Amino acid sequence: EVQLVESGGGLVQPGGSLRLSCAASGSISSVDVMSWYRQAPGKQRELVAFITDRGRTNYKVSVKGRFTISRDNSKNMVYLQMNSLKPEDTADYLCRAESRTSWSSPSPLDVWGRGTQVTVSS
């Protein structure tokens, strides 16, 4: 079972950029979905972006056009490039690996990282 560790968090000015990394302990090329989530104090955890095994991506409406999720299979990495950051993007960002039960993967996969802290503030 893969293990996930996030890095790249920090503080940045509104309008600024950050790049987060989700490092997996092994190949994630076969994982149905790799996701980035975020959670701010007192709020629900929110799905921000995902990339499928086949490379299809989608985005939370509020970040579309300024965030990009991508993957490097040779490095077992998933990245979240964040641009034009707003105070409302402040949160702990966490990655997740999910695969539903299937014939070739009878055991379900649902693994979370511990998170990296993003603060958008002046």
Residue numbers in the entry: 1 to 82, 82A, 82B, 82C, 83 to 100, 100A, 100B, 100C, ...
Any passages from the paper?
In conclusion, we have developed an immunogen and a small antibody that may have great potential for development of novel anti-HIV/AIDS vaccines and treatments.
The trimeric HIV-1 envelope glycoprotein (Env), composed of its receptor binding subunit gp120 and the fusion protein gp41, is the main target for neutralizing antibodies. Because Env gp41 contains highly conserved sequences that are exposed during the conformational changes leading to membrane fusion a considerable effort is underway to target gp41 with a focus on the membrane proximal external region (MPER). Llamas (Lama glama) and other Camelidae produce classical antibodies as well as heavy chain-only antibodies.
